[PDB]
From a paper:
In this work, we performed structural and biochemical characterization of the [name] esterase, a novel member of the GDSAG motif subfamily of the bHSL family. The protein was obtained from the metagenomic DNA library constructed from the permafrost-derived microcosm. The [name] esterase demonstrated low thermal stability with rapid inactivation upon incubation at 40 °C, which is typical for the cold-active enzymes. The [name] demonstrated a typical fold for the bHSL family with however a unique tetrameric architecture.
Author numbering:
A (entry chain A), B (entry chain B), C (entry chain A), D (entry chain B): 1 to 302
Write the structure that this text describes.
């Protein structure tokens, strides 16, 4: 109430205890996928949306249509989950909310996960997801690509992939707490680490090794904050101040700016990693951030 | 989608058949209260709100606090229901959404119903409800008073009661499809009646008899569209174009204007009676109207 | 400051003295046209607009392009002035502001005036102005027509003219203090007359006789508040509470609503006739009203 | 029009030739102050504002009151001008527009300039200015502190001075193209320098020498992008992508984030240095940025 988030303090402590448990006892991947799906799949979608599954040519996900939306405009969202877990199902509750806020159709897309499918399996999928969307008759200018953490990793990598293949860029990209350096470098590990109850250096190290499967962390397609960002589209990045991954957002911003790009960065005080995904626990900062992102997505698509 | 309401056509047909059933077979009061509670009580409240019951000094209802709201500002809402049915429980889903959109606390207040408690029992309750809120340490200029149909009836009569008792007015009133003439007069019965699938002349005639219990329809406290509106506060009125009650809204507007009041009237094309209460069936027009109303209530207490 | 208009009280007194002078001494028409042009033409246009004169086939006015505008969207504005005075030049300062607020191109159009050119000279011009605009490649759905007082008279008449000629309607019409009953009827003459410092029954009587030149006041094309408004487009009407012409706005609203139309009416407390035209004296209520109108024009054109 | 800035291309060319002239022929300080005052003093202030001079206890400037503003909320703005030139008079046109957009009172404050008054004369003034405003009975959380380039330098140093003197911070700071590193370091000198038509490395080097008068560039109070930003308030920074000073904005952002601050950074594609100060040449991007900044300042003091 009244401009403060009454839930963040409580949610942070829940995260502290939760992290202490996962640090002491590193659980099954297949097990954490189910429990992730179970928790998140149980969160009600945005009101008033039609959801249609997609399953054609190994391209898989869901079209989310807010009934108020402009159906000529598309958000392509890739869930996060360290490239280990997450799905369309789990992120439906967030992507639907972002769609309804932006007044656009969302493509809530799946992609192959590590350890079973290391780099470049995910990224090939993301490119195929993007081709799928273009093939529905959306022009590049009618697309924002997005994702949080690992999905943020894919979203940013896709743009680099499109540049390499000399292909036109979407209208923009929305990155939420994106993970853009799979070598875990930045002032924020040390500086924000005591304030980050959710994400540890150790966790990312492990997610990174499984994803790369010996591929170098220095590869820009793996670590987008190591790329030259010349000719990428407009960017909106949301990150929390209380995040080891803070530095990746600021660095990508630096590079985007240096490449001459329109780039907006909002670092939210007191916010933990991908806090909008946690709107069910954090309705004040989480919904307000979904509205901020929604408004940029909407402005960006014209 | 795309500016259009894809559900109103279908919802109107459901209402036609519904009305045809209730016209042919006039059901029990006690039965229709339960069925009304059951359907509307099942609609999820606005996300992220805290709801506390109220039951002291014959004042009964619910405080709804949106977690983002300003706790020093208050909406007092009276459900409609022809003064025969409806409750806090039934209207929770609407009043919560209105509160969340307005960024204010809602008092979702009960009042005694006809035929058991004819006029002036409900209005005595509404005044009690108003005093109760003031007693929580809200000043008059921190209150919007509100309600749809019969609730709109009470809201608007409350203002008249406050004027009679030479009391400060709230900062405004929000009226949704208010029923302001309990004699069922107006061009709209004939002009809009073939387009109104939900509200008949005959149903209101009946609801009016039960509420009045022999009291005159001419009495301004029963029929606010028969009052002189000198010194009332700012008004926002939403009403649908496809409503027998349309003329009551336009007349109250006329009178408000003639008394020199700030008055905003939005007649929504194609909209049926209290369509925002039906946001679960009408997500496009219903949520958009809740947002409109929310924006006004916020600007009004800003 | 702080939600009150610090200029209205002063401006009202200036109007009282001004009206007392014009009542005692009815001046030259040709003289009042120059002095009207002189005062209003001296008001700076909205910042950042390109203005191009139009002079082709007796169609005359100005294209106002806000540099931020969407050039596929058009406002057609007809100045008021009792059908005796006013011009593109005089209303440029208002129409430019409305254009810039709405983000659309404005066609600020001239039309022949009484006494030299009584009805239907003006209205023939308004229709030709509208044809001119369509011929620039604007579709009907990309047009709002508008005007204040007498311009409000023309705007509303044009819509009736389009219906008669079985021609498609524009997307909407914006009417500011429109004068829609050239017989001077309504509760507001008596009820608002002591509060209206600018517009008198006598003035309108005189403007009406010159315009009609024996044509009947009962003709709907002369008095749009006497028409059946079936099949007109969406409406936004702004009027002040302190206006003898208040009743015309409320009646047109009533009729629009009764015909099933989307109609928005905002009656502003304390506001005098066409107060947005007086934004140079009334920057609080005048600019805020231009923003309200701008936002509706923008929403209406998609 | 249509999303595009039709004037930036032309304005950039004017800046190229302007810079080429001043590079070849380095003009008088006293002369450039007059020419700067003459050009900018001629730009009309925001419509509807009251401006009062201030000259007491060595504090000098202007109170700008937008007639619609909230008089309990205040923006303190320091003009830029390389700490060599600029004045209240020159920046009136921008600060008035910012105030009018934000709905707050502006303190448009002077400060002593180099070479006559080197560091710390300006900063002593800025602190004086701040105290003066507090003394008008504004609380810290009713103040945004602001300035562009050199003004941004002072604004951001003021916050550091307030921290040193263990004083309450204002509610936020708005920095436009701030000059935060007076050693002229950053990737952007090389990366953005061919795209910056307005600001050269050489000009800043000179402005830095005159301001420092032998003081070290390393001093945080001179170079805020060298400070630790612990406990500063919320930040909004606008900077253009085509600016040698881009890196200073990104670095201050980095530091703010690392100190845990709420920080919003908007890098505008194609925009030259302090482009909102050039709204008279750049109405599309300049007014849109004033509105963005205004919206933030309003939300911040809301």
């Amino acid at each position: 109430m009244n401009g403060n988030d009454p839930d963040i303090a409580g949610f942070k402590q829940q995260l502290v205890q939760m992290t202490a448990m996962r640090e002491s006892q590193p659980p099954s991947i297949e097990i954490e996928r189910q429990m992730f799906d179970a928790q998140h799949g149980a969160v009600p979608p945005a009101e008033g949306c039609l959801i249609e599954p997609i399953s054609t040519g190994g391209v898989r996900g869901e079209r989310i249509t807010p009934k108020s939306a402009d159906t000529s405009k598309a958000l392509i969202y890739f869930h996060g989950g360290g490239h280990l877990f997450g799905s369309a199902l789990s992120h439906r509750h967030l992507v639907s909310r972002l769609a309804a806020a932006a007044g656009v159709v969302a493509y809530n897309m799946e992609y192959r996960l590590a350890p079973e499918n290391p780099y470049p399996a995910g990224l090939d999928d993301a490119e195929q997801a993007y081709r799928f969307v273009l093939a529905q008759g959306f022009k590049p200018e009618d697309i924002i690509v997005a994702g949080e953490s690992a999905g943020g990793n894919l979203a940013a990598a896709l743009l680099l992939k499109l540049r390499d293949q000399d292909l036109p860029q979407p209208a923009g990209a929305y990155l939420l707490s994106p993970w853009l350096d799979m070598s875990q470098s930045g002032a924020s590990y040390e500086a924000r680490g005591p304030h980050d109850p959710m994400i540890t250096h150790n966790a990312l190290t492990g997610c990174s090794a499984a994803y790369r499967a010996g591929a170098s962390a220095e590869d820009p397609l793996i670590s987008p904050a190591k790329a030259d960002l010349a000719d990428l589209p407009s960017l909106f990045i949301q990150v929390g101040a209380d995040e080891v991954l803070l530095s990746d957002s600021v660095e990508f911003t630096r590079r985007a700016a240096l490449a001459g790009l329109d780039v907006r960065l909002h670092v939210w005080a007191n916010m933990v990693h991908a806090w909008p995904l946690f709107h069910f626990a954090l309705p004040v900062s989480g919904l307000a951030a979904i509205d901020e992102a929604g408004a940029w997505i909407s402005r960006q698509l014209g």
